[PDB]
């Protein structure tokens, strides 16, 4: 509801950004290894087995709870058996929608002060974000980044409208339906990502401040958090824990500020991120002076408050991620704070100053500085788009674990755009596993071999008579694979083959182990293969096992596995589900969550209080 040039300008700018961003995300097509882990859970859920990684166990492997079910719905609607295309389409659409939403939300912030004026809208903070090459790397992978972008854009627009909605129509701020919708949207943040709660919850607090009475506060708090409470109850009843389990596997001991600073420097130095920040701060502090240099309830619901809320949210997210320790990818975890910090300057107005503040030649010089600053920002973006990137250090393991994943997997395979699971069959140990499985009708345990790029085989116990014969379509024994990269194996082997890792993403035994040494980020807490041999229907004697395994350790682990307290936790996720199982799992989730075991079997025996088995000799 403003003048014609203001209406058209904004529109064209938006279109431009969208187009470019789309192109920038089509020339870099790939799917990550971590993106193929969601698809196995989706396949299990569409097969009638439930939200699990393996059919016989109830283990949570996805930390989004919304991306997984959205992809499940998409794969249910689409009758095609390919799920990578669903993920590609959804990620692209969500990223573009989020950028459009944030631009439209920022325009309404400046709209009220442009009444009866001639001005234009120019894209400032939207171009900067899409100029960064890692932003276009992760705009199309199998992760949930686009979902985060869309959620943040919607929340920003709704909060701006809520802050500006104060007009006192009938002694009330806004309508009740809008308040309920905003409360539900704010409460829905913990499901999307856990650390995002600090954003959404903050918004909720503001609403609770502005309510006139206690009745409205109770209504808002009840409406806001119904769905997260229901899902928490379901998770406690079904999985027997208070947390997804991947967070349970890590056993933190404190802050790591030095690694976070190293990660921040590594992110900054390819692209020189300080110059756009300085220029955008200059533009922001310059645009405010033209508008003019110049109880708690009125103050909280004001346009000045939402800007501070967004900036504080961005700073808090950055501090949390820096204290955590960073990541082993180039720029993955520092994009959400960057998106949050650039929201208030996503689009800027350019206009001739009023006659009542500066006369004639003083207004002709105020627009020139704004134009020159915008031109400098555009030049920086154009330069930084065509940047080589991290450099010739993203293909090996250096002193730090940070690496560029897209080029790593492009050279690991032989494809410039690895998009499907058939493209990942060219990994060095991928074609051999199929033949290894096909050559063992009675089943086996597969381990990496230290001499070549094939697999070592540990056979299983043969079936007894009258059980081998009573089989449908022949008899197939149990197959288990022990490895570190799960997505490529999980999307290839099949739904009746058990795929386990060592850190504890899908291994319930390795997630209950304690920590002794810090080591490298993410590649520091690995379980011995002797534990894997100990549990499973496989042989345990030297004529059938490789020479780098210790049989005394195998016997000690086998004897330690019969602890009464370990048995309860094991059957919490393996016994058939019913009503009493749901109730017992709800009552004992807290104590199951805070349970730890020791890596070395002898010390475990010592802790539990069980006798030591005699030497095999």
């Amino acid at each position, epitope marked *: 509801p403003y003048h014609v040039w203001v209406r058209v300008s904004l529109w064209v700018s938006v279109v431009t950004v969208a187009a470019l961003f789309g192109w920038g995300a089509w020339q870099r097509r790939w799917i990550a290894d971590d993106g193929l882990i969601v698809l196995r859970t989706v396949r299990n859920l569409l097969a009638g087995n439930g939200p699990v990684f393996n059919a016989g166990e109830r283990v949570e492997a996805n930390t989004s709870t919304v991306w997984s079910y959205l992809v499940t719905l998409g794969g249910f609607v689409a009758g095609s058996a390919r799920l990578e295309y669903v993920a590609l389409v959804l990620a692209l659409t969500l990223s573009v929608l989020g950028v459009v939403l944030v631009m439209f939300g920022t325009a309404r912030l400046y709209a009220p002060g442009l009444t009866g004026r001639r001005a234009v809208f120019l894209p400032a903070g939207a171009l900067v974000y899409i100029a960064i090459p890692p932003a276009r790397d992760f705009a199309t992978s199998g992760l949930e980044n686009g979902l985060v972008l869309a959620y943040l854009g919607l929340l920003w627009w709704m909060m701006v409208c809520w802050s500006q909605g104060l007009r006192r129509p009938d002694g009330e701020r806004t309508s009740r339906g809008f308040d309920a919708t905003l409360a539900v949207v704010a409460g829905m943040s913990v499901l999307v990502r856990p650390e995002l709660a600090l954003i959404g919850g903050l918004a909720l607090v503001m609403m609770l401040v502005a309510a006139p009475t206690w009745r409205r506060r109770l209504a808002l708090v009840v409406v806001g958090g119904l769905i997260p409470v229901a899902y928490q109850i379901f998770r406690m009843g079904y999985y027997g824990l208070l947390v997804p389990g991947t967070a349970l596997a890590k056993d933190a001991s404190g802050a790591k500020w*030095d*690694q976070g600073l*190293v990660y921040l420097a590594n992110f900054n130095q390819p692209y020189l991120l300080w110059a756009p920040a300085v220029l955008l701060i200059g533009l922001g502090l310059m645009v405010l002076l033209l508008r003019g240099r110049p109880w708690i309830a009125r103050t909280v619901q004001s346009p000045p408050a939402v800007v501070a809320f967004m900036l504080i949210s961005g700073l808090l997210q950055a501090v949390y991620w820096i204290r955590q320790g960073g990541d082993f990818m180039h720029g993955r975890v520092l994009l959400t704070p960057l998106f949050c910090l650039l929201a208030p300057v996503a689009v800027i107005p350019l206009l001739l100053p009023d006659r009542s503040r500066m006369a004639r030649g003083a207004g002709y010089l105020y627009a020139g500085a704004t134009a020159v600053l915008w031109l400098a920002v555009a030049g920086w973006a154009l330069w930084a788009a065509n940047s080589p990137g991290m450099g010739a250090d993203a293909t090996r*393991v250096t*002193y*730090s674990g940070i690496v560029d994943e897209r080029r790593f997997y492009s050279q690991a395979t032989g494809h410039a755009h690895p998009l499907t699971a058939a493209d990942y069959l060219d990994y060095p140990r991928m074609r051999a596993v199929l033949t290894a499985i096909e050559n063992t009708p009675d089943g086996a345990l597969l381990l*990496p*071999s*230290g*001499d*070549y*790029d094939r697999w070592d085989v540990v056979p299983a116990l043969p079936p007894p008579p009258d059980v081998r014969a009573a089989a449908v379509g022949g008899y197939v024994g149990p197959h288990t694979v022990f490895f570190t990269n799960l997505g490529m194996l999980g999307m290839n082997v099949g739904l009746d083959v058990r795929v386990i890792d060592q850190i504890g993403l899908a291994n319930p035994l390795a997630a209950h182990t304690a*920590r*002794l*040494t*810090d*080591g*490298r980020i993410g*590649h*520091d*807490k*690995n*379980l*011995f293969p002797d534990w894997a041999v100990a549990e499973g229907p496989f042989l345990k004697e*030297p004529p059938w096992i490789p*020479q*780098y*395994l*210790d*049989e005394d*350790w195998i016997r000690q682990a086998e004897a330690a596995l019969k602890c009464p307290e370990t048995d309860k936790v094991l059957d919490a996720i393996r016994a058939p589900m019913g009503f009493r199982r749901f109730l017992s799992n709800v009552m004992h989730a807290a104590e199951y969550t805070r349970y730890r075991i020791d*890596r*070395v079997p002898l010390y475990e025996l010592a802790r539990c209080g069980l006798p030591v088995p005699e*030497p*095999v*000799d």
Partner: antibody
Amino acid sequence: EVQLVESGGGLVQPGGSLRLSCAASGFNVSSSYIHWVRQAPGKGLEWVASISSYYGYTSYADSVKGRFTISADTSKNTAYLQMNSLRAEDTAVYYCARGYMYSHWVYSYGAIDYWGQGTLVTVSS
Amino acid sequence: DIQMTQSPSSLSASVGDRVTITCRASQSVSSSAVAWYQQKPGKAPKLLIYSASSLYSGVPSRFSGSRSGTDFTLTISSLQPEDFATYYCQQSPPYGPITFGQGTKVELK
């Protein structure tokens, strides 16, 4: 070329503390086993402690189990050995060494490949 | 606890002779991870034999090892003047503790 450079050592009062360092070149300490071995004057060899960063495993001898401490700083490729309550019979030349690993995965043959030069520690006074 | 008894303790041999050193354990040695080392006075040890029957890279062919049940043996045929040192037998499981033996010394006459 693989190199192991050792530093930190001298005279210490009985009941004192002294730390040892070892810098590695040519390989990553995150995928190999590191051992400490000492040799008392006119005596044989004696294993002290070992560490594995890939597995989070740490082991000590029975004589120095509660008083010594071995760690690793993968950011600088360095290994450490803290020594506390140094009784007078802890004087010897201390060696750092690397294990002989399999080529295609993280397994060991049970032997030692490369030995450092050594750094003597005198715990008498 | 595993203990290794190395014998003999001192050998007198001349140039171009055959030398045999035997290291003996007590318990089961199914690990078969016995390794042999060489150390000259004032230097660090050098690896010669690993897995009790396998010869390391760069080591001359004169050195050999054999597993006679619980007994282990090192063999040198036609020693050269650059072979007079002190030797050690070592045992270790895949993760377990390292155990050494009492060194032997060879002289020249």
